[model samples]
Target: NSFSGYLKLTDNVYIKNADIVEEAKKVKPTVVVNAANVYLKHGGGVAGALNKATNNAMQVESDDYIATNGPLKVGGSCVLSGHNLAKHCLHVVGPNVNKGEDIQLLKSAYENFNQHEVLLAPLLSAGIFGADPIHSLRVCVDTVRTNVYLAVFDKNLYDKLVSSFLE
Candidate 1:
């Protein structure tokens, strides 16, 4: 996805797109933050299935990967830190709500970055567990805005998001 599209079409930026797991290793990042339904295969019910698969790669390559339960622990978690999703897993729990803002996890991601990777995240899972489709989608957008604004003081968080993802 073109993370720069959220900015200006005229402006060009190199937004790397690789298998999220592969990119984590290539980038040698400290962690990978992800908000996914299950492990991309487990039907979003099994907790560590995705974590195991992703960490399997990280372990082989000697990378660190962390997973979290966004705001609501509907089923699975998000990828945070490192490249491998096979070794480590962290489940960030919050109030038991089918839908709501995962401000805590967002805050953790931001605070952990401590200002360095503030502008890095674009679209993350914040409140993807809503009961309805429209409400769930809105929470996604709202969470993105809240994170970017808090991290970098930019209200135009969508501007930092890659538009091609919409494609």
Candidate 2:
């Protein structure tokens, strides 16, 4: 069955086809979570875009932190202070899709976050890592079974993701 429009995954969880960073400005969530590589470069996908949106402030801090505190294992996470966006930025090293453990790592990424009150997350692992978007989205939905918002860039894919929850 196709998603009718908007479907709530949990009491307050919702999905929207919006730019992750822009949506963060609108809602000012408690945290903005993005998928990161072990190096924490934030060079591409949601990570790169979010890093750029913050004028590379986040990237700099994240990189510094990673250099000192990383390389974080898959599913490991660290928090960086948000720059004029949200309260904090949570970076998680998702499982490398090429390594054949994307779903477990994605779930770990979500579960590793300290706060679930109001989070901004993108379609984790699906962009540069090339994980199946639908499969990744399903992992996201299952892992974050609390209050969180998912920012999806593609309207068609967003619709498909929303629909999957209803089914």
Candidate 3:
């Protein structure tokens, strides 16, 4: 069942017609996911939005995290303080298909955060990284197996997700 009409939703997932940053402001989930780069830098897209929303504290900790752990490889991830928005934030570095990497690396990224009770995510690697939204959607549905929120900006994406979700 949905939480106040947040269905085409699922006990395990929701295809929300909104932005992840906006959802984070309201829902303030247990974890906010960043479609991050390998450096953990909040350069742009979903990453920049979440980082900026956290008043740069997200990026502040990201610096220390990467400084200690080094570049997060494709499919690699790290969990950092989410500042005032959520208890934690997750970072997953997706593969760049243009760089000869396979998009399946996106799956590994989602798998990293599978333990969180509630998670808010964007369409992973669908932007800038050049993966299709359909593919990213599949990656999301295939992996995020519980307490998931997909804050979508595009109605087209949301519609398909709604039709696609059965579990």
Candidate 4:
């Protein structure tokens, strides 16, 4: 149903409280951003769901990508192909709150998705990596230069983002 309660933060931005993968299926974004780990392991959360959506081929291919390129650079990304949710995947490592230049790093992560036309992304690093959901989304709205869907999975984060944004 394209889940409601979202308004464009800009000409090309959308914020929705829904499962990112499910939202991706509905929108069929040209690229889906995986707030991935350094290893591109797709272990859990957003990454895990992306891997599952691709029926695990994404992981097999991701393994090959890491084998060829080594761990993803902090705030950088690699393109992984195949899928129903989106035409391709953008795997990026976000700045852990424990790390350096976190805000800039998060900005870099979202900027990496800019080259694609349409995108779907979850709150990067706001869960396990311990970034603030508000900041994580703020960075996305700032630098992502195309049609971007910011999907919120956590209820508290959704409430925070929705309340904080569209008053």
> Least lDDT summed over 10 consecutive residues: which range in candidate 1?
145-154
Top TM-score prediction, candidate number: 4
lDDT (Cα, 0-100) at 1 in candidate 4 = 27
lDDT of 3 by residue, 1-167 (tens): 12233664445766777877777778767888888888887888878888888788888888998888899989888888878767788887888786777887878877876878778777777767888777777677778777777788778877876666643
Q: Rate the local accuracy (lDDT) of all candidates.
A: 0.32, 0.74, 0.77, 0.79
- List, residue by residue over 1-167, the lDDT tens digit for candidate 1: 11221232122212332343433333433433433432222233222333454545433322223233213343334434333432222233322235554433433332322222322322333233333322322333433332221111123433333343244
TM-score of 3: 0.87
Those runs of model 4 whose alpha carbons end farther than 4 Å from true positions after fitting are 1-5, 98-101
Residues 9-121, candidate 2: write the lDDT tens digits.
76756677888877877767778887788788776778888888888898778778867875778788877887877888887777777767655677777676535556777
| Candidate closest to the true structure, highest lDDT | 4
Better of 1 and 2 by lDDT: 2
Residue 164 in candidate 2, Cα distance off native in Å: 2.0
Clashes of 4: 0
Against the hidden true structure, what lDDT does model 2 obtain?
A: 0.74
List TM-score per model, in order. Answer: 0.33, 0.85, 0.87, 0.88
55: Cα error in model 1, Å: 5.6
- Candidate 2 TM-score, true structure as reference: 0.85
Report lDDT (Cα) of residue 7, candidate 1.
32
- Please provide, for model 4 over 46-108, each residue's C-alpha lDDT reduced to its tens digit, 9 standing for 90 to 100: 889878988898899989988998998889998888477777888888887765546568887
